[PDB]
Design a protein around this motif. Sequence first.
Motif, PDB file in Angstrom:
ATOM      1  N   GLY A 101     -14.820  29.535  32.793  1.00  0.00           N
ATOM      2  CA  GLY A 101     -15.619  30.733  33.008  1.00  0.00           C
ATOM      3  C   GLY A 101     -15.898  31.438  31.691  1.00  0.00           C
ATOM      4  O   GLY A 101     -15.121  31.295  30.747  1.00  0.00           O
ATOM      5  N   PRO A 102     -17.000  32.202  31.606  1.00  0.00           N
ATOM      6  CA  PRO A 102     -18.011  32.463  32.628  1.00  0.00           C
ATOM      7  C   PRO A 102     -19.174  31.478  32.568  1.00  0.00           C
ATOM      8  O   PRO A 102     -19.458  30.854  31.536  1.00  0.00           O
ATOM      9  CB  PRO A 102     -18.497  33.860  32.264  1.00  0.00           C
ATOM     10  N   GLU A 103     -19.837  31.355  33.710  1.00  0.00           N
ATOM     11  CA  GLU A 103     -21.002  30.496  33.869  1.00  0.00           C
ATOM     12  C   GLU A 103     -20.734  29.088  33.331  1.00  0.00           C
ATOM     13  O   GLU A 103     -21.398  28.632  32.392  1.00  0.00           O
ATOM     14  CB  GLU A 103     -22.252  31.108  33.251  1.00  0.00           C
ATOM     15  N   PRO A 104     -19.782  28.368  33.921  1.00  0.00           N
ATOM     16  CA  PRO A 104     -19.525  26.992  33.489  1.00  0.00           C
ATOM     17  C   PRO A 104     -20.721  26.096  33.761  1.00  0.00           C
ATOM     18  O   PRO A 104     -21.408  26.230  34.777  1.00  0.00           O
ATOM     19  CB  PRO A 104     -18.329  26.570  34.351  1.00  0.00           C
ATOM     20  N   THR A 105     -20.934  25.140  32.861  1.00  0.00           N
ATOM     21  CA  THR A 105     -21.965  24.134  33.024  1.00  0.00           C
ATOM     22  C   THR A 105     -21.443  22.832  32.432  1.00  0.00           C
ATOM     23  O   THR A 105     -20.746  22.846  31.420  1.00  0.00           O
ATOM     24  CB  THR A 105     -23.255  24.567  32.306  1.00  0.00           C
ATOM     25  N   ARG A 106     -21.814  21.718  33.053  1.00  0.00           N
ATOM     26  CA  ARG A 106     -21.381  20.377  32.698  1.00  0.00           C
ATOM     27  C   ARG A 106     -22.620  19.575  32.311  1.00  0.00           C
ATOM     28  O   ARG A 106     -23.713  19.822  32.830  1.00  0.00           O
ATOM     29  CB  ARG A 106     -20.701  19.721  33.940  1.00  0.00           C
ATOM     30  N   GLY A 107     -22.462  18.609  31.407  1.00  0.00           N
ATOM     31  CA  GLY A 107     -23.559  17.745  31.017  1.00  0.00           C
ATOM     32  C   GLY A 107     -23.762  16.574  31.957  1.00  0.00           C
ATOM     33  O   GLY A 107     -23.241  16.532  33.073  1.00  0.00           O
ATOM     34  N   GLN A 108     -24.537  15.601  31.479  1.00  0.00           N
ATOM     35  CA  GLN A 108     -24.910  14.443  32.280  1.00  0.00           C
ATOM     36  C   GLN A 108     -23.946  13.277  32.130  1.00  0.00           C
ATOM     37  O   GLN A 108     -23.974  12.360  32.955  1.00  0.00           O
ATOM     38  CB  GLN A 108     -26.322  13.975  31.915  1.00  0.00           C
ATOM     39  N   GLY A 109     -23.105  13.291  31.108  1.00  0.00           N
ATOM     40  CA  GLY A 109     -22.086  12.277  30.913  1.00  0.00           C
ATOM     41  C   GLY A 109     -22.538  11.130  30.031  1.00  0.00           C
ATOM     42  O   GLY A 109     -23.721  10.790  29.942  1.00  0.00           O
ATOM     43  N   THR A 110     -21.551  10.504  29.386  1.00  0.00           N
ATOM     44  CA  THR A 110     -21.734   9.265  28.644  1.00  0.00           C
ATOM     45  C   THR A 110     -20.550   8.348  28.945  1.00  0.00           C
ATOM     46  O   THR A 110     -19.396   8.776  28.897  1.00  0.00           O
ATOM     47  CB  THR A 110     -21.933   9.535  27.136  1.00  0.00           C
ATOM     48  N   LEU A 111     -20.837   7.100  29.299  1.00  0.00           N
ATOM     49  CA  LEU A 111     -19.801   6.154  29.705  1.00  0.00           C
ATOM     50  C   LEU A 111     -19.123   5.514  28.499  1.00  0.00           C
ATOM     51  O   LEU A 111     -19.792   5.015  27.588  1.00  0.00           O
ATOM     52  CB  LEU A 111     -20.420   5.056  30.571  1.00  0.00           C
ATOM     53  N   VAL A 112     -17.793   5.495  28.524  1.00  0.00           N
ATOM     54  CA  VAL A 112     -16.970   4.764  27.569  1.00  0.00           C
ATOM     55  C   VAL A 112     -16.184   3.724  28.359  1.00  0.00           C
ATOM     56  O   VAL A 112     -15.418   4.079  29.260  1.00  0.00           O
ATOM     57  CB  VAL A 112     -16.018   5.722  26.838  1.00  0.00           C
ATOM     58  N   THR A 113     -16.359   2.445  28.017  1.00  0.00           N
ATOM     59  CA  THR A 113     -15.612   1.366  28.652  1.00  0.00           C
ATOM     60  C   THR A 113     -14.850   0.634  27.560  1.00  0.00           C
ATOM     61  O   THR A 113     -15.459   0.120  26.618  1.00  0.00           O
ATOM     62  CB  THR A 113     -16.542   0.394  29.376  1.00  0.00           C
ATOM     63  N   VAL A 114     -13.529   0.602  27.676  1.00  0.00           N
ATOM     64  CA  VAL A 114     -12.669  -0.005  26.667  1.00  0.00           C
ATOM     65  C   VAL A 114     -12.077  -1.266  27.279  1.00  0.00           C
ATOM     66  O   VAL A 114     -11.331  -1.191  28.261  1.00  0.00           O
ATOM     67  CB  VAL A 114     -11.563   0.956  26.207  1.00  0.00           C
ATOM     68  N   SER A 115     -12.401  -2.422  26.704  1.00  0.00           N
ATOM     69  CA  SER A 115     -12.013  -3.691  27.300  1.00  0.00           C
ATOM     70  C   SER A 115     -11.834  -4.738  26.219  1.00  0.00           C
ATOM     71  O   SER A 115     -12.615  -4.799  25.268  1.00  0.00           O
ATOM     72  CB  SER A 115     -13.121  -4.171  28.234  1.00  0.00           C
ATOM     73  N   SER A 116     -10.832  -5.586  26.401  1.00  0.00           N
ATOM     74  CA  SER A 116     -10.749  -6.827  25.653  1.00  0.00           C
ATOM     75  C   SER A 116     -11.437  -7.931  26.453  1.00  0.00           C
ATOM     76  O   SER A 116     -12.107  -7.664  27.456  1.00  0.00           O
ATOM     77  CB  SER A 116      -9.292  -7.178  25.364  1.00  0.00           C
TER      78      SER A 116
END
Length: 116
Positions: A101-116
């Motif tokens: 707070g106040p007026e929280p806002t979230r973005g659209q996201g970016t994917l992180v994939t960690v793999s061998s």
Amino acid sequence: EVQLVESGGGLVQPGGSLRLSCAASGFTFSTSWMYWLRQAPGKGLEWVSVINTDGGTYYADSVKGRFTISRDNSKNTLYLQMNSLRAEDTAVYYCAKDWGGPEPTRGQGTLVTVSS
């Protein structure tokens, strides 16, 4: 409207690094606390990192010494430097404004994939 536009995710091997960025607009960036959150697939949101208006920072335990949050107020940008990535870091990462707070806002996201 507020816009938070994240990028920089990708598919990476364990031990690698990524740098996420978020481009912010539509609010007064320099007076907001800024956050990185993540949602691992199958789970809900969890906080990762937080930066206050004087540049002081807080981190979730599992990312200390690995991830660094920083802000560039002049360029309305939030960064997450992600070093020494682990498989368990696989998640969508979200930028967020004033999540406590106040007026929280979230973005659209970016994917992180960690793999061998």
